[PDB]
Enzyme design. Structure first.
Site, PDB file in Angstrom:
ATOM      1  N   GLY D  30      -7.505  -0.530  -4.978  1.00 51.88           N
ATOM      2  CA  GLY D  30      -6.104  -0.597  -5.345  1.00 51.88           C
ATOM      3  C   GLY D  30      -5.787  -1.213  -6.694  1.00 51.88           C
ATOM      4  CB  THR D  31      -2.468  -1.759  -8.314  1.00 50.57           C
ATOM      5  OG1 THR D  31      -2.161  -0.452  -8.803  1.00 50.57           O
ATOM      6  CG2 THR D  31      -1.873  -2.803  -9.224  1.00 50.57           C
ATOM      7  CB  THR D  32      -5.662  -5.754 -10.688  1.00 52.62           C
ATOM      8  OG1 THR D  32      -5.354  -7.056 -11.192  1.00 52.62           O
ATOM      9  CG2 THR D  32      -5.537  -4.710 -11.788  1.00 52.62           C
ATOM     10  CD  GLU D  47      -3.079  -1.935 -12.945  1.00 54.27           C
ATOM     11  OE1 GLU D  47      -3.477  -0.780 -13.218  1.00 54.27           O
ATOM     12  OE2 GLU D  47      -3.865  -2.894 -12.777  1.00 54.27           O
ATOM     13  CB  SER D  75      -4.552  -5.472  -4.417  1.00 60.14           C
ATOM     14  OG  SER D  75      -4.063  -6.458  -5.307  1.00 60.14           O
TER      15      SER D  75
END
Lengths: 244, 233, 204, 244, 222, 198, 250, 243, 196
Positions: D30-32, D47, D75
């Site tokens: 996933g996104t950080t 993010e 995340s």
């Protein structure tokens, strides 16, 4: 999920058979043999205690013959524990009937009830069937002396003489060979002992490995009496019939 | 791989995926195309209806949730019925208890949460349908994209279904153009009918083949079918 | 009104020398109207005797219940229940209905088949055990019965004498009670035999 | 044998729960996002990949608030994150209703912990496909926490998870050294916007959107609030500046 | 009913009369109002006899099981907590009024429990219709640091106050002594100040006085 | 209330039941049959609360017929009555009890003897030569106590009733519009359709 | 959540065997040996206290438990299963008997209850049979002294003497030799100490052995006096000392 | 067939693999701990290994305060440790409420052990991969150490150790007792008993400790508490001067 | 019953009489109406002895579990728990509770929970049948931040008047002092306060 570990005890085989029931029956077939013979004046229940020891207490026991009512008793073949669960519910059913109608429960009504219970574990619940087969010996004022049999499938039938457990095939043939409609209780007591004596997987057929019971209507009285032979009484009846 | 991990949604793959959900998302793409676009005054839904035979009707794809909200479906019809119906209640609840119209951003939250519950417990299956939700609430026009994975996103415009990527590019390029089509609904609807035909291929949008819905500043979510959309074909 | 005064009836038990007696009237009425002169209130499960006064329907129900329980008790224990044990069963059974009681007044009489010792007990409608070595009373004429017993009674009476005593106690109380009478029956219990005599009394 | 990775509560021969681990893979994918504990509060940043120009900016908010003083960012699988917050919100309302005082951050952590750990006990459920960084100010200090799908969680000086998880962790470790006495709220906000830009390298292919939130006893009164407008831009730039 | 509890230097003692009534009529001339909860925790109970017996045995049973489970001696405070939470649940409908005493690994204790579930602690207590007669005696002769025999006297005297002055109380006196180190000693009928004077005549009847109509043997054997 | 009388003679049981059905100020019907046939040799008459009365009888009838089919046998009168008592004894402590009184008369084909059972709404059962429910007993029991003999013929029984019914028509305040009589014997149940002027 | 395991985990196999029960019995086989002997005026049950570290306190772990003041039990197999079984047994003794009849249940009946509990774990949904076998010894007024064995299947039988566990076969043989219907309790306590010597490898003293008997009433173990009919428990666990004193004359 | 390794049903050898694998999980943290009994106190020592610098060292513990008197140290993953701690806290709270006195250490142990036995028999409950050591100064039994495992087994110890290097610690302790001949550390102050603990911890492990490498819990009459970084440092310094 | 809690300079003090009556009979003359729910959180009980005791026991249970997980609870939290029980079950309770505790950050605090189930934080609070008679005296003599002896005196006089007029109150006056210094138990016999 859990579906992974589900045996599915209540499904049909491509042949239309119930896997678990057939296997339970296969189990019963390795249990001590029990004979049920119905005479004109009584009924005889005989059973062979499968495997024993010198220390096994034979007096403080009754592992295959159980009293259900005052006029009904059964011989067990299979899991003693499973049998006890069914026997107890059966003893309760008899009493509810008595309390409801103030009359002893007719033998067939009690047998059908228990069979139905067994049949249930066959059609729903996902639980294993009861690995037990019963021979019912009882009396009532509508059919007099009756003999029945019920197995894991939940089916039950009536007999003049029948057997359950191991070597039933051999035993049923011997019985079907010397049984006679007019038979008297003592003749039956003898046929039973002879039959077991010829199917046993043991050396001799001693008293410590036997259980005997008779539902006779003692002439001197006018009613029915159940008698579960004591160790000694089995020892005697064993000498008389000539097996020392 | 996959073979052993797509038995049900309660199972994670070794890579970290939920196949049952991805398969659900698949039924969406296999579904007919539909488009959504909004300005600052209106929001429009244009959808391509599908039929079996030439003796069969064209499956409706636009559903009205309240007077200020509605959506379009792509995939399993039944699931849209279930979801739109759950959303109809949520709107009705907000009106009755708080005498308030349900914020489009909040409608999306409810959908996301309902869908997620079906992807973590044994026995249930993910919803197999995609939804585009338009609505004019207390903060203007709105458009949302709902994915069975439980992911809801607010956009200016978008499309879902087969060949949906055509319309999605047209719109991603026409952005600055329609985002300003305020005050005029007929322009947004035409722009919508255009973006949608960017995803055509088989036939050309006919009268009983097209379906357009709109809502805005002074427009209570209304549905147009047949002759009603003729002036846009 | 009072469920214990609709049907009427009395019961009394007494202890003698190596014996116990339990008697009861035979009346079953509906307020002032007499309905049956054959309603016996003494029952037995094996060698244990139980008398029940109170609301007839419950008297009947409790009898059917204890028959049911003592029957299963015998099948499991393979022995007949004893007086002291039965008394406990009655008590716990009655309390199980603490907030919806059976309107009855039970009396237990019997001889411990293992110790040959005589035994009698009484309980209230919710199971409170009342233990006595001399006599126990119950029913709509319990005051009169207490009156008689308290005077007429004396220890270690012999079977043929205890009978006379118990009978006179029952008879004279039933005659001072409008809801009791219409016949009586006495039970003389001994370590081996039990005699049942129907007494002769006025029928009004 | 094998197959120890198909059911959510099975112990493999080495003592692991593969499903919980496969869950983690979804997190890393996933996104950080990160969390930075300051001298009197905490800062959360994440993010937001911009799939296209169709995503209305500033509209698809990811950070969430629990009660009035808690910030939660995660995340991995977004839907699971929400589900975990919805729970935390109820969990917190329940606590306030009984004790009056709003739930302590440590107390709140264990609630989420116990709940998450719970989804690794039965095979009828799946573990949470998210790692969550949350915290806030309370009766005695500020607290920052990170919770794993295993249900494991600890207090942190600074924390990060998602794709750029290594870049972030590195930046954080520096700050921890070059500021032994403690960073400030205003500072952490900038420092956070930076670490996100940097860590965005492991995904430099797509354009993103920044999001910051903080909870400072002095700057916000102990209440969680979103960094918007000017204070936001000031931190965006501070980043764009050190990104070159 | 008159029930009391008195604490002494190395233990506690409880006593009670033996009259059980039904309205103005004596049901039992010698019933026991002293109940055993565990070997060293005994209970005195007034109020509804069936309730004091029942509640007392129920807790006693659970206490025995708890004791076996924890491999420890039962504590009087445990029988007290179980008794009161049970009585409280039934909002007073279980008419049990108890004086619970005993010794355990933590000393000697004396408590009282009312039907509604409230409890009191003290060195001397009384309950029942005789409550006031007894308390009048306790308020007059109690003193701190009584000897085991002084306590048994005070307790015995308090119950008497009730037997004589209260109509709800009568017959005999039952005591039970629990000492910190020894076994609890139950003294059934410690006092019997009410024996019936020989009747003035014998009412034995000449056999045949009672007219019989029919007779028969009863079947007992199966 | 209603009239529910029953008398057991030598080889049969006779049940007499009033025909009136009064609702408030008016007599709605004058030909009501307050009875149900539980089995070919068992009959039950009943009186009591407005709805409970028939609902209970038909419920009891249904169960007995089910038992007969399941078992291809007819329960003894004693068995049927014990069953019915249990039902009433159950409802007495229920939310809303059946307020019904019944007379069960049957011919025990196995003992070859007629039997009469009286059970009130509380579940109080008693077996009698002759019985009645409500006020009926108050007027008739003295006549029956007098003229009743265990060896009476069905004919002597119908005459004893006739006498009872007359005393009732004389001293009782209510017009119960006569009765319907039925005989239960070794041959089943039949109705004496001529008691209005027998 | 929720036990989705509502089906049997013990089912019949083609041969007619019940796997899980067979396996449970195999577990009992690997367990430490335990035994019981019935004299004419008492019963004795005993086992070995297999410590799992000299740091562990062997007293804080009894393998011989009192079920009622006249019934005791011992086992072979999985200790934990035994523990929960003992609790359920002590309780059923009350709920199903003492609370109804005011007295403790007779040995055969309590055994029957225990047996029932084990049977259900053989057929109920989502569970495995108990991995133990018990030897229950007690006494009741109308049956005297008795000794029973309850297996994982729920089956149970009475014995004059027997052993279960590791070296049950060897021990059962040694018992047949030394048993007779005229033994006195002390004679059986002796025979017991001998039979158990063969099973124990290491130390054999009153601290490595656990032995209790069902004999006479112990009025000193009652806790109170004043009630004639209450004479005390017939169950008594021997003390470390009482053991050693007999280990000498061994 | 092959599934008798996934749920808690018997294997043909009469074994329960899932319970054996849960035991494996108890060493996953690579932490060692031990406990000894003073004359009137009980001490528990446990390694504190905080790897990451981003971690707030004060929130990293495997020792819990169950009740005013009971202390529990856990060997195993933290989520299962916290699950076990919460349960035990709730159980000790309720026990007090229902019975009127504080739940004894050995009893709470049996209760938690019984709960663990359940997961051993029921198929939908997985065992907890932890080993629980309970300590306190019971009002009837004095200093007490009771430990439970995933198999549902439990017992009291004179002293004990748990972790990867469990055996080294155990034999070390075993020997000290074969020597002193008594079943406890003969000291009056707990500070000294704590020192003894940290000392033998070092001998058996062959490693030196700083003030952030340990974690100490002390149980005393009516109270169980844990030492702080500095209370420990003070303990380290004391043993320093003598060696 | 006469009970009160007063907050002063160093903390807070709780006082009560020791008489519980059932009608005109004094069932207990040495009653302890000052109940401990936590180390430094106590309460005064008025109303149904059975009800307040059961409430107190449950509260003590809740605070003990709160402590096990979140450390020492605030005096406000204890009052909150009492309120939760008293309000949610108002129809089945007859309890008047005064909650008083000592915190180191908040010093001394007093909360009163009357019949309804509502909570009221005050400098001091009085309750119980006897309280009615001292509303005047108390409003005239209470001063904020009195000394320990000043407060122990304010309470001793107030309750002595309450015990004086109200027959439901009497016996001995008990007190419990709650300060950083710890927990102190005071008792005052008839011969002393009857002469004030």
């Amino acid at each position: 999920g859990s579906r992974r570990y589900d045996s599915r005890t209540t499904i049909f085989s491509p042949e239309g058979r119930l896997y678990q029931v057939e296997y339970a029956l296969e189990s019963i077939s390795h249990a001590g043999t029990a004979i049920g013979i119905m005479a004109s004046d009584g009924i005889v229940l005989a059973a062979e205690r499968k495997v024993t020891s010198t220390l096994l207490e034979q007096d403080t026991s009754t592992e295959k013959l159980y009293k259900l009512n005052d006029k009904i008793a059964v011989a067990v073949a299979g899991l003693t524990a499973d049998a006890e669960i069914l026997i107890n519910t059966a003893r309760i059913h008899a009493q509810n009937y008595l309390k409801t109608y103030n009359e002893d429960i007719p033998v067939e009504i009690l047998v059908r009830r228990l069979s139905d219970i067994k049949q249930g574990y066959t059609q729903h619940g996902g639980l294993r069937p009861f690995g037990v087969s019963f021979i019912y010996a009882g009396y009532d004022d509508r059919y007099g002396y009756q003999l029945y049999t019920s197995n894991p499938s939940g089916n039950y039938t009536g007999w003049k003489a029948i057997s359950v457990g191991a070597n039933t095939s051999a035993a049923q043939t011997l019985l079907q060979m010397d049984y006679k409609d007019d038979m008297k209780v003592d003749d039956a007591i003898e046929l039973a002992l002879k039959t077991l004596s010829k199917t046993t997987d043991s050396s001799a057929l001693t008293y410590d490995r036997l259980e005997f019971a008779t539902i006779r209507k003692g002439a001197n009285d006018g009613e029915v009496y159940q008698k579960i032979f004591k160790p000694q009484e089995i020892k005697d009846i064993l000498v008389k019939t000539g097996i020392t | 791989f996959r073979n052993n991990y797509d038995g049900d949604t309660v199972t994670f793959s070794p890579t970290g995926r939920l196949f049952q959900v991805e398969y659900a998302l698949e039924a969406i793409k296999q579904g007919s195309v539909t488009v959504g676009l909004r300005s600052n005054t209106h929001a429009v839904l244009v959808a391509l209806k599908r039929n079996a035979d030439e003796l069969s009707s064209y499956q409706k794809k636009i559903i009205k949730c309240d007077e200020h909200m509605g959506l379009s479906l792509a995939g399993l019809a039944p699931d849209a019925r279930v979801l739109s119906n759950y959303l109809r209640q949520q709107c009705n609840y907000s009106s009755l208890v708080f005498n308030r119209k349900l914020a489009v951003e909040r409608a999306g939250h409810l959908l996301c949460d309902k869908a997620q519950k079906n992807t973590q417990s044994y026995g249930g299956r993910p919803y197999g349908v995609g939804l585009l939700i338009i609505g004019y609430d207390k903060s203007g026009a709105h458009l949302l994209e709902f994915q069975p994975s439980g992911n809801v996103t607010e956009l200016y415009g978008t499309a879902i279904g087969a060949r949906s990527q055509g319309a999605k590019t047209y719109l991603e390029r026409t952005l600055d153009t329609f985002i300003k089509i305020d005050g005029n609904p007929d322009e947004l609807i035409k722009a919508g009918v255009e973006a949608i035909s960017q995803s055509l291929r088989d036939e050309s949008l006919t009268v009983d083949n097209l379906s357009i819905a709109i809502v805005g500043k002074d427009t209570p979510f209304t549905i147009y079918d047949g002759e009603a959309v003729a002036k846009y074909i | 009104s009072d469920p214990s005064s609709i049907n009427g009836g009395i019961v009394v038990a007494m202890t003698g020398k190596d014996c116990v007696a339990i008697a009861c009237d035979l009346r079953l009425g509906s307020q002032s109207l007499g309905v049956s002169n054959k309603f016996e209130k003494i029952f037995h499960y094996g060698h244990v005797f139980l008398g029940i006064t109170g609301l007839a329907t419950d008297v009947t129900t409790l009898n059917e219940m204890f028959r049911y329980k003592t029957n299963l008790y015998k099948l499991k224990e393979e022995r007949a229940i004893e007086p002291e044990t039965f008394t406990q069963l009655v008590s716990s059974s009655l309390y199980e209905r603490r907030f919806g009681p059976y309107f009855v007044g039970p009396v237990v009489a019997g001889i411990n088949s293992k110790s040959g010792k005589p035994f009698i007990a009484g309980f209230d409608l919710i199971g409170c055990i009342d233990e006595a070595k001399d006599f126990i009373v119950s029913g709509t004429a319990s005051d009169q019965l207490f009156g008689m017993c308290e005077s007429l009674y004396e220890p270690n009476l012999e079977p043929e004498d205890l009978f006379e005593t118990i009978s006179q106690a029952l008879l004279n109380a039933a005659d001072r009670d409008a809801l009791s009478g219409w016949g009586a029956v006495v039970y003389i219990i001994k370590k081996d035999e039990v005699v049942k005599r129907y007494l002769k009394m006025r029928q009004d | 044998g094998t197959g120890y990775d198909l059911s959510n509560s099975v112990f493999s021969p080495d003592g692991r729960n593969f499903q919980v681990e496969y869950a983690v893979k979804a997190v890393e994918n996933g996104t950080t996002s990160i969390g930075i504990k300051c001298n009197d509060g905490v800062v959360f940043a994440v993010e937001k990949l911009i799939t296209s120009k169709l995503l209305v900016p500033q509209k698809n908010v990811k950070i969430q608030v629990v009660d009035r003083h808690i910030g939660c960012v995660y995340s991995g699988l977004i839907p699971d994150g929400r589900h975990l917050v919805n729970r935390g919100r109820e969990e917190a309302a329940s606590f306030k209703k009984l004790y009056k005082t709003p739930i302590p951050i440590p107390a709140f952590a264990d609630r989420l912990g116990q709940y998450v750990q719970a989804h690794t006990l039965y095979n009828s459920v799946r573990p949470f496909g998210v790692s969550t960084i949350f915290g806030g100010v309370d009766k005695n200090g500020a607290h920052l926490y990170m919770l794993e799908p295993s249900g494991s969680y600890w207090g942190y000086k600074g924390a990060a998870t998602g794709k750029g998880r290594q870049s972030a962790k590195a930046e954080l470790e520096k700050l921890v050294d070059h500021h032994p006495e403690g960073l400030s709220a205003r500072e952490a906000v900038k420092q956070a916007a930076k670490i996100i830009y940097l860590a965005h390298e492991d995904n430099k292919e797509k354009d993103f959107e920044l999001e910051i939130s903080w909870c400072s006893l002095s700057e916000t009164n102990g209440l969680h609030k979103f960094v918007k407008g000017d204070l936001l831009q000031e931190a965006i730039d501070f980043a764009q500046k050190e990104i070159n | 009913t008159t029930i009391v509890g008195v604490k002494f230097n190395n233990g506690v003692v409880i006593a009670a009369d033996t009259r059980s009534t039904q309205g103005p009529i004596v049901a039992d001339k010698n019933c026991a109002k002293l109940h055993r909860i565990s070997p060293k925790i005994w209970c005195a109970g007034a109020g509804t006899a069936a309730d004091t017996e029942a509640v007392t045995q129920l807790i006693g049973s659970n206490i025995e099981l708890h004791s076996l489970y924890t491999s420890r001696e039962p504590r009087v405070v445990s029988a007290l907590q179980m008794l009161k939470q049970h009585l409280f649940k039934y909002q007073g409908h279980i008419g049990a009024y108890l004086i619970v005493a005993g010794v355990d690994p933590t000393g000697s204790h004396l408590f009282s429990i009312h039907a509604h579930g409230s409890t009191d602690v003290g060195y001397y207590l009384s309950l029942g219709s005789g409550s006031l007669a007894a308390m009048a005696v306790l308020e007059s002769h109690w003193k701190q640091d009584l000897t085991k025999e002084e306590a048994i006297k005070l307790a015995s005297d308090a119950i008497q106050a009730g037997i004589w002055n209260d109509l709800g109380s009568g017959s005999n006196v039952d005591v039970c002594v629990m000492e910190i180190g020894k076994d609890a000693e139950y003294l059934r009928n410690y006092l019997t100040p009410n024996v019936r004077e020989e009747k003035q005549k014998s009412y034995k009847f000449p056999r045949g006085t009672t007219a019989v109509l029919k007779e028969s043997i009863v079947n007992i054997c199966d | 209330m209603d009239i529910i009388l029953g008398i057991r003679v030598q080889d049969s049981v006779i049940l007499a039941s009033s025909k009136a059905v009064t609702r408030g100020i008016s007599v709605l019907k004058d030909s009501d049959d307050k009875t149900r046939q539980l089995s070919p040799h068992t009959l039950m008459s009943f009186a009591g609360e407005a709805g409970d009365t028939v609902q209970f009888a038909e419920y009891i009838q249904a169960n007995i017929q089910l038992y007969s089919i399941r078992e291809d046998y007819e329960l003894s009168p004693q068995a049927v009555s014990s069953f019915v008592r249990q039902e009433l004894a159950k409802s007495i402590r229920s939310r809303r009890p059946y307020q019904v009184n019944v007379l069960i008369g049957g011919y025990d084909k196995k003992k070859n003897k007629p039997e009469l059972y009286q059970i009130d709404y509380l579940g109080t059962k008693v077996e009698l030569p002759y019985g009645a429910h409500g006020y009926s007993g108050f007027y008739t029991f003295s006549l029956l106590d007098h003229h009743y003999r265990p060896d009476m013929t069905t004919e002597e029984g119908l005459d004893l009733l006739k006498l009872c019914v007359q005393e009732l028509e004389k001293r009782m305040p209510m017009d119960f519009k006569g009765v319907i009589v039925k005989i239960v014997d070794k041959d089943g149940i039949r109705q004496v359709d001529d008691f209005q002027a027998q | 959540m929720t036990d989705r395991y509502s089906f049997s985990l013990t089912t019949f196999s083609p041969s007619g065997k019940l796997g899980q029960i067979d396996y449970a019995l195999t577990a009992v086989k690997q367990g430490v040996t335990s035994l019981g002997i019935k004299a004419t005026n008492g019963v004795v049950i005993a086992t070995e206290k297999k410590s799992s570290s000299p740091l562990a306190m062997s007293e804080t772990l009894s393998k011989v438990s009192l079920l009622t003041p006249d019934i005791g039990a011992v086992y072979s197999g999985m200790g934990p299963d035994y523990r929960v079984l003992v609790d359920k047994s002590r309780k059923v003794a009350h709920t199903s008997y003492k609370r109804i009849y005011g007295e403790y249940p007779p040995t055969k009946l309590l055994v029957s209850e225990v047996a029932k509990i084990m049977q259900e774990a053989t057929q109920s949904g989502g569970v495995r049979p108990f991995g133990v076998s018990l030897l229950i010894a007690g006494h009741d007024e109308f049956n005297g002294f008795s000794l029973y064995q309850v297996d994982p299947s729920g089956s149970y039988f009475p014995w004059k003497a027997t052993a279960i566990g590791k070296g049950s076969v060897a021990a059962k043989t040694f018992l047949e030799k030394r048993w007779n219907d005229e033994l006195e309790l002390e004679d059986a306590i002796h025979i017991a100490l001998l039979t158990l010597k063969e099973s124990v490898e290491g130390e054999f003293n009153g601290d490595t052995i656990e032995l209790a008997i069902i004999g006479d009433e112990n009025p000193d173990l009652l806790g109170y006096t004043g009630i004639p009919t209450d004479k005390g428990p017939r169950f008594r666990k021997l003390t470390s000392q009482e053991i050693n004193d007999r280990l000498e004359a061994l | 067939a092959g599934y008798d390794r996934h749920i808690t049903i018997f294997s043909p050898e009469g074994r329960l693999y899932q319970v054996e694998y849960a035991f494996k999980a108890t060493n996953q943290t690579n932490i060692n701990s031990l406990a000894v009994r003073g004359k009137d106190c009980t001490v528990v020592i446990s390694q504190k290994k905080v790897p990451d610098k981003l971690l707030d060292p004060t929130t990293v513990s495997y020792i819990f305060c169950i009740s005013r008197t009971i202390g529990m140290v856990v060997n195993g993953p933290i989520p299962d440790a916290r699950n076990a701690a919460l349960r035990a806290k709730a159980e000790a709270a309720e026990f007090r409420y229902k019975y009127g006195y504080d739940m004894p250490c050995d009893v709470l142990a049996k209760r938690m052990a019984n709960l663990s036995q359940i997961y051993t028999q029921r198929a939908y409950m997985r065992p907890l991969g932890v080993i629980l050591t309970f300590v306190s100064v019971d009002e009837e039994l004095g200093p007490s150490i009771y430990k439970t495992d995933p198999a549902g087994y439990y017992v009291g110890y004179k002293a004990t150790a748990t972790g990867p290097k469990q055996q080294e610690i155990t034999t070390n302790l075993e020997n000290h007792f074969k020597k002193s001949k008594i079943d406890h550390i003969n000291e009056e102050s707990w500070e000294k008993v704590v020192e003894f603990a940290i000392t033998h911890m070092i001998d058996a492990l062959g490693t030196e400790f700083s003030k952030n490498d340990l974690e100490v819990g002390v149980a005393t009459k009516d109270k169980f508490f844990t030492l702080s970084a500095e209370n420990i440092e003070e303990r380290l310094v004391a043993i320093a001067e003598q060696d | 019953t006469s009970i009160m809690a007063v907050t002063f300079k160093d903390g807070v003090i709780l006082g009560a009489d020791s008489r519980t009556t059932t009608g005109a009979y004094i069932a207990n003359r040495v009653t302890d109406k000052l109940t401990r729910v936590h180390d430094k959180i106590w309460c005064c009980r008025s109303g149904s002895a059975a009800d307040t005791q059961a409430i107190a026991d449950i509260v003590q249970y809740h605070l003990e579990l709160y402590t096990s997980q979140y450390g020492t609870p605030s005096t406000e939290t204890a009052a909150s728990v009492f309120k939760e029980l008293c309000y949610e079950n108002k129809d089945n309770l007859t309890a008047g509770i005064i909650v008083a505790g000592y915190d180191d950050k908040n010093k001394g605090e007093v909360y009163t929970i009357p019949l309804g189930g509502s909570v009221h934080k005050l400098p001091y609070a009085i309750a119980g049948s006897g309280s009615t008679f001292i509303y005047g005296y108390c409003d005239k003599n209470f001063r904020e931040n009195m000394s320990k002896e000043e407060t122990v005196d304010f309470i001793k006089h107030s309750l002595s008047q309450a015990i004086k007029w109200d027959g439901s109150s009497g016996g001995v006056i008990r007190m419990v002092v709650l300060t950083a210094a710890g927990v102190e138990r005071l008792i005052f016999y008839p011969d002393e306060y009857e002469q004030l």
